[PDB]
Amino acid sequence: GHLGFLPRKRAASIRARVKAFPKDDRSKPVALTSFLGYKAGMTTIVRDLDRPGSKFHKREVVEAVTVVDTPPVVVVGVVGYVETPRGLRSLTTVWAEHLSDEVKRRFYKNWYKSKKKAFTKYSAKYAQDGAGIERELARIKKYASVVRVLVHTQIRKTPLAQKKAHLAEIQLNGGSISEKVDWAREHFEKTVAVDSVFEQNEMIDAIAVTKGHGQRGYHSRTSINHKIYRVGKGDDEANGATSFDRTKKTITPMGGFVHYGEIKNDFIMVKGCIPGNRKRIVTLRKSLYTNTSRKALEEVSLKWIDTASKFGKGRFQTPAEKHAFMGTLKKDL
RNA sequence: AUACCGAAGCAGAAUUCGGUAA
RNA sequence: GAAUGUUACCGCAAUAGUAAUUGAACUUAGUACGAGAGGAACAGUUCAUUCGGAUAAUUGGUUUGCGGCUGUCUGAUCAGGCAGCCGCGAAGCUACAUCCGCUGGAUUAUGGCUGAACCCUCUAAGUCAGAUCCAUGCUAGAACGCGGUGAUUUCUUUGCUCCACACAAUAUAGAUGGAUACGAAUAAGGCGUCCUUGUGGCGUCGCUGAACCAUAGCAGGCUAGCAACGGUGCACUUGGCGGAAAGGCCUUGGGUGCUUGCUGGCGAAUUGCAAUGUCAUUUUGCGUGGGGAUAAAUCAUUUGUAUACGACUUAGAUGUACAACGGGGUAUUGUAAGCAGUACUGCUGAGAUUACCUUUGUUGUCUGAUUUGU
């Protein structure tokens, strides 16, 4: 057994705690250092191997790729940090004036029984000329060194019975922390898309809690060197609008995703599998730095995508395939 | 446990020796 | 899972566990070498084996649900009620399935530079290249670590909280004028000045704080006069600085006492020759007035990512919120009940189930007990 991955004690929460960020680039424009989303099932994808010298070089090759259910990231605040001899410390936290019901639920377990006195008087302080809630920005500018944005996911968009919001801190790539806080404030209550941070062929890393076998499993894990193959937009239609297979369909498997994960929002395709099963929230990061190897730098296309259901063994790809061979079906037509 | 140095009439391949190190 | 404020969310990390590993192919190659066969090599690329984490794209040992097969039989073909067998296949157990498994410093052995010991010297003063130690990363989080943040019982007869005054208990790891702020060197640094502004010139300081600020009044009162509007106890007000443990530093203007800077008038006694002769706050308790806000958690209900049992993850006090359904998709089966007679033929790839998604219309529910609170 691995010595580093011991003891095997289970994680304390579904969300995996991120404790490392890709340094701090003082020259890059302001951008998010990571992304948050939810994990769906898995599928299959094939692409052309442009890698030189490979056995399957310049040939179509099948690769296993998972699908991450990514809801839009709506900013709710930002957190500043200051260097100290006792380690990094969060000097001040601020919020985006207004908070959705899902965000308020995160602070409540018996939400229905509670009088729902969530963020309210704080908004009353904001409901004026600003003063303290505006001087906090100046205080952050004066002393802060690294600023982490505070965002939550649109859980109600995800097909999850649990409507409680999930929130985590994300560091800002850009320098000039004044610009960091200015951009964060301007983005208060705004919605951020995947294209604003990640991009196709980027070697992102995945971190999440492992599957529980029902103590084996249910522990946080980090997987690095995973290449994105296509930015997905499940809000629209015809997600399979690739250059090949001009018979546009949807990435959703027949009858919906197995067990759970009926995609109804943005999604992303990532090379290989991801730790943990569906219904688990997964955070994405740029993998610190980008390797210069062809396996990490080369860009890839996409073609065949499997759509047959897995509620059994799998056969039918689309409902329109059932005709001709079955003759008459008086029960239906 | 593998390799890093100096030497051999060590052309190359290849081989041996003194030190580091398990 | 027990305790410091109540509860909960997002964070930091003192600390500890460390992780990768070997071979193979191209191009540098038939190149340098070399009579000759034979055959280097850095760097750039492509794969798998040893080991580790994952998930099921596929595979794999792994809902009597669909077709029919035997027996006890309803009378009788339609039914298997009871005990199972041949094809398809999940649900999980669970691997013979798949991907991935990182880049920066200081060193040493070692190769040099400057340069004495005494021409030389990689070493004595230092330094460049350079594998063992630490960093990056991953895993847990002091449950005897820390920061920020959502809210602070509308009646315990202001209940909670911060303040003003106001009486007690509680004790001190131990006041009895003042922690009375640069940096850098110790084979030199300040101070005041000059400036043709520098590693500069001039005068000079240390050799201890054995000092600096203050220190006089019944333990510190009343009052009179002189010189200035300086010093200072205290309530305000304009503004700046301090985020490392900033929680302090002040700054403008008056207001109000003292002023021992100087000169006078008042009382000190009896504690009897002394008995620390009681003056600081740390915490907590009770009595009023000046304001501020009025919430949260457990069980229940349940969920299924979780699941040996705990635990964990959820939904709900009026909106497609919770949940039933048949429908729809999904998976499965290949000729079912009968009727058309030509000794199996059209309905009939049929009906069909469907613990996965789906909940479109109807329909039912939406209200309880306990606890917390500086």
Curated annotation (Swiss-Prot):
Cross-link (Glycyl lysine isopeptide (Lys-Gly) (interchain with G-Cter in ubiquitin)): 28, 125
Superkingdom of the source species: Eukaryota
Keyword terms, alphabetized: Cytoplasm, Isopeptide bond, Methylation, Phosphoprotein, Ribonucleoprotein, Ribosomal protein, Ubl conjugation
Localization in the cell: Cytoplasm
Extra information: Present with 450 molecules/cell in log phase SD medium.
Protein family (similarity comment): Belongs to the universal ribosomal protein uL3 family.
The protein's role, per its UniProt record: Component of the ribosome, a large ribonucleoprotein complex responsible for the synthesis of proteins in the cell. The small ribosomal subunit (SSU) binds messenger RNAs (mRNAs) and translates the encoded message by selecting cognate aminoacyl-transfer RNA (tRNA) molecules. The large subunit (LSU) contains the ribosomal catalytic site termed the peptidyl transferase center (PTC), which catalyzes the formation of peptide bonds, thereby polymerizing the amino acids delivered by tRNAs into a polypeptide chain.
Name of the protein this chain belongs to: Large ribosomal subunit protein uL3
Organism: Saccharomyces cerevisiae (strain ATCC 204508 / S288c) (Baker's yeast)
